[PDB]
Amino acid sequence: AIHVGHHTLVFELFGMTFNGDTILATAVTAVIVIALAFYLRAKVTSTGVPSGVQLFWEALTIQMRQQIEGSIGMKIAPFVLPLSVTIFVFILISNWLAVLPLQYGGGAAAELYKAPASDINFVLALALFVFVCYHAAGIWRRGIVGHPIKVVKGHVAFLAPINIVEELAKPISLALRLFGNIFAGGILVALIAMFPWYIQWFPNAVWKTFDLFVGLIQAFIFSLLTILYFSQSME
Amino acid sequence: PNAIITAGALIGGGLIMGGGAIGAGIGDGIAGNALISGIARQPEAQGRLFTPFFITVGLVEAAYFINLAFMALFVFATPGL
Amino acid sequence: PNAIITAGALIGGGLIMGGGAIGAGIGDGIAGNALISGIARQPEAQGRLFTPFFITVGLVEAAYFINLAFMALFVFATPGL
Amino acid sequence: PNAIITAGALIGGGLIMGGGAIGAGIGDGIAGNALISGIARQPEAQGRLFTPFFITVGLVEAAYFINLAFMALFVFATPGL
Amino acid sequence: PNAIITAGALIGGGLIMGGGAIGAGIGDGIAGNALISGIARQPEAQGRLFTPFFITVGLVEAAYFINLAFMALFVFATPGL
Amino acid sequence: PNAIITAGALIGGGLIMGGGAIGAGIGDGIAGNALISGIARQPEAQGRLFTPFFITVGLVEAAYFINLAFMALFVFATPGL
Amino acid sequence: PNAIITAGALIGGGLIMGGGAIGAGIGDGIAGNALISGIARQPEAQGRLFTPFFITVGLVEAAYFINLAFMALFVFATPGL
Amino acid sequence: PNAIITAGALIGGGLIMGGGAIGAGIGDGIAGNALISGIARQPEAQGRLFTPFFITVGLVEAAYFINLAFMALFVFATPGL
Amino acid sequence: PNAIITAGALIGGGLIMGGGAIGAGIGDGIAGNALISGIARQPEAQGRLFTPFFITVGLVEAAYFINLAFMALFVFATPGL
Amino acid sequence: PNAIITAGALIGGGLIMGGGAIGAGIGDGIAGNALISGIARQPEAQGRLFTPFFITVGLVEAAYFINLAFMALFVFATPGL
C-alpha cells in the first residue's frame, strides 16, 4: 500500500519537529547549487570562451532579466533577479534530483532522496518567503500606508473582496502548485514500484521523463509567477 | 461507521480530481491553442509568448493542484473520520 | 447517524471543489487564450492586457474561492451534523 | 430519518455549487476573453467595454449567486427535513 | 419512507439547479462575448446589440428559471410524497 | 419499495432536467453569439438572421422541452412503481 | 429487488437523457452558429448551407434519439428486471 | 445480490450512454460547424469537404458506437453478476 | 460483499467510458473542425494536414482506449474482491 | 466494511479517470486544432509548431497521468481500507 508522509530521519529540537529526510534533500540540492555557483566563480571569464556552467548561468540570468524588464525594470526591482534565478535552480535541481535511480524496496517502496517539494514544509518556506519579500517590496515602493490601500483597491475598487482573497491565494497556490505537482509524482513512482521489475522498468522511464519535463515547467512557472507578483506589488 | 465515511471520502476526492483534471486539461489545451496559433501567425512570438502562456498555465494548474491538495486531505486525512 | 452525514458532506464538498476547479481552470484558460493572442498580435500589449486579464481571472476565481470556502464549511464544519 | 435527509441536502447543495461555479467560471472566462480581445484590438475602448462586460458578468454571477442562495437553503433550511 | 424520498428529491433538485446554473452561466458568457466584441468593433452597435443580446439572454435565462421552478417543485413540494 | 423507486425517479428527473438545461442554455448562447456577431457586422442582417436563429433555437429548445415531458413521466406517473 | 433495479434503471435512463440533451443542445447550437454566420456572410447561399446544416443536425439529433430509444429500454423494458 | 449488481450495471450503462451522447453530439456539432463555415466561405467546396467531415464524423461515431456496445455489454451481459 | 463491490466497479467503469467518450468525441470533433477548415481554405493542404490530424487524434483516441482497457479491468478483473 | 470501501474506491477512481479522460481528450483536441490550423496557414511552420504543441500536450497528458496515478492509488492501494 501507499503511504503519505512517513518521513525518515525525523527529529525534535527547540520544541519543534523536523523532517530529517526533507532537510537532507534540501541540503543536497543546496550544496549542488552552491557547487555550481563556486565552479562558476572559479571558472567565470568575459575575455574568453565561456564554460558550460557559465553558459547555463548566463542563459538563466538573461531569461530572468528578460521577464523582469518586461514587467518591472531592474531600475525599480534589481533584487528580484538574484531571487527569481535561485528559486528556479533551487526548485529545478530539487526536482531533477528525484530522477536519479535512488528508489528501492524496503517490502514497501522507499527512496534515498525524495523531492523536497513533495513536503509541504519546503514549498511553504519558498512560497511564504516570496510572499513576505514582494509584500515588503510593495510596502517600500508604495509605503506602509499606501501599499495595503492599493492592494485592497486593485485594478477595480468595487471588486475589493475579490482582491484581498486573491492576495492571500497567491502564496498558497504558489506553494500548492509546486507541492501537488511533485507530491503527486511521489505517489505515481511509488505505485509503479508495485509492478514487477520487467513491467516496472518502462512506466518509470515514461514518468521520469515527465518528471523532468514537469519539474522544469514548475520551476519556470514558480519563478515567473514570483516575478509577476513583484511586478504587481511594486506598482 | 468508519467504512461509510471512508467510501464517502473516496467518492468526494474522486469528484475533486475529476473536476480538477477536466479544468486543467481543457484550460491547458486552450492556452496551448492560443500559444500555437500565435507562434504560427508570427514565428518569433516563440520568445515572448511563453511568459503569458506559463502564467495562464500557472493559473490553470493552480485550481487543479489546490484540488489535489484537498484530495489528499479527503483521502489520507479525512476531515470527518 | 453522523457517519452518513459526514459521508454526504464529503461527497458534497467533492462536488463543490470539482465544479469550482472546472470553472476556474476553463475560465482561466479561456482568458489566457485572449491574453496570449493579444500579446502575439502586439508585444506592447504585454503591458496593458494584464489589467483586463487579471480582472477576469479574479472574477473567475471568485466562484472558485467562495465554493472552496463553503467546502471548508462542509467537511470541517458540517450543517446538520 | 434526519441523517439521510441531511446527507441528501449536503449532496444537493454540493451539486448546486459545483454547477454554479462551473457556469460562473466558464462564463466569466468567456466574457473576459472578449474584453481582453477588444482591449487588445482597440486600446481606447477599455472604458467603453467594461459596461457590456460587467453587465454580462453581472448576469453570469447572478446565476451563480442565486444558486448559492439556494445552497444555503438546502444545507441550513433543508426543506422537507 | 419520507426520509429516502426527501433525500432523493434534494439530490434531484440539486442536479436540476446545478445544470441550470451551468447552462445559464455558460450561455450568458457566450452571448456576452459576442456583445462585447461587437461593441468593441462598433461603438454605435451598443444600442442595437442589446436587442439580439437580451433575446439570447432571455432564452438562456428562460431555461434557467424553468429549472428553478421545477427545483422548487422538487424540494418544497414533493411529487412522490 | 415505492420510496426507493420514487427517490430514483426524482434523481433521474433531476439528471434529465440538468442535462436539458445545460444543453438549452449553452446552445442558445452559442446561437445568439452568431446572431449578435452577424447583427454587429451587418446591422441590416437582423431580419435575415432571425430565420437561421429561431430554427437553431427551435432545435435546441426542442431537445430541452422533450426532456421536460420525460421528466414529468419520471416525476409524475413514475414508471415501474 | 425490483425496487432497487427499477430505481437504478430510472437513474440510468435519467443519465442517458441528460447526456443526450446536453449533446443535442450543444451540437445544435454549434451547428446553428455556423449556419447563422454563413447566412450572414453569404445571404444567397442559404440553400447550399441548409443541406450541410440538416446533415449535421441529422447526426447530433440521431445521437439524441438513439439515446432516447435506449432510455425507454431502461425505463419501460428494464432489461435486468 | 443480483438486484444490486443489476442496478449498478444500469447506472453504469446510463453513464456510458450519457457520455457517449455528449461526446457524439458535441463533436458532430463542431465538425458540422466547420463544414458549414467552409461551405459558406466557398460554396463550391461542398463536395471537397465531405471527406474530412466524414472522417471526423466516423471517428466520433466510432467512439459513440463502441461506447453503446459497451453499454449493451453492461446491461444485457453484465460482467460478473 | 461481492455484490456491492461489483456494483461499484460497474458504476466506476460506466463513469470511465462515459468521460472517455466525452473526451474522444469532443477532441476528435475539435481536431476535425481544424482539418475541415484548413482544407476549405487550402484545398491542396490535405496531404500535409492529415499528419498533424492523426497525431492529435492519435493522442485523443489514446486517452479513449486507455480508459477502455482499464474499464475492462474494472468490470472483468475488478480489483478488491 | 471492506466491501463498502472498495465500492467507494472504485467509484472514486472511475470519476478520477472520467475527468482525466475528458480533460486530456478535449485539451489534446483543442491543441491539435491550433496545430492543424497553423500548419494549414503556414506549411513550413510545422517543425516550429511541434514545440508549442508537445509542451501543451506534455501538460495535459501530465494531468491525465497524475489522475491515472491516483486512480491506481484508489483502486490498487485503496487508502483507508
Binding site: 570562451v49 565561456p50 558550460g52 553558459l55 530522477v99 536519479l100 535511480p101 528508489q103 528501492y104 524496496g105 517502496a109 513512482v189 509503479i192 514500484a193 509492478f195 514487477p196 521489475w197 520487467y198 513491467i199 516496472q200 522498468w201 518502462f202 512506466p203 518509470n204 522511464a205 521520469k208 521523463t209 523532468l212 | - | - | - | - | - | - | - | - | -
Partner: protein, 40 residues
C-alpha cells in the same frame, strides 16, 4: 531488489533517451554559443 532493478532500468532508459535525443541539441546550442562568444 526487484524494485531497485526495475527503477534502475527505467533510469537507464530515460538516460539513453536524453543522451541520444536531448543531449545532442543542447550540446549544439552550447557549442554555438561558445563559437559566437569566440567570434565576438
Amino acid at each position: 531488489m526487484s524494485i531497485f532493478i526495475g527503477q534502475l532500468i527505467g533510469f537507464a532508459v530515460i538516460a539513453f533517451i536524453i543522451v541520444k535525443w536531448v543531449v545532442p541539441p543542447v550540446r549544439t546550442l552550447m557549442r554555438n554559443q561558445q563559437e559566437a562568444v569566440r567570434a565576438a
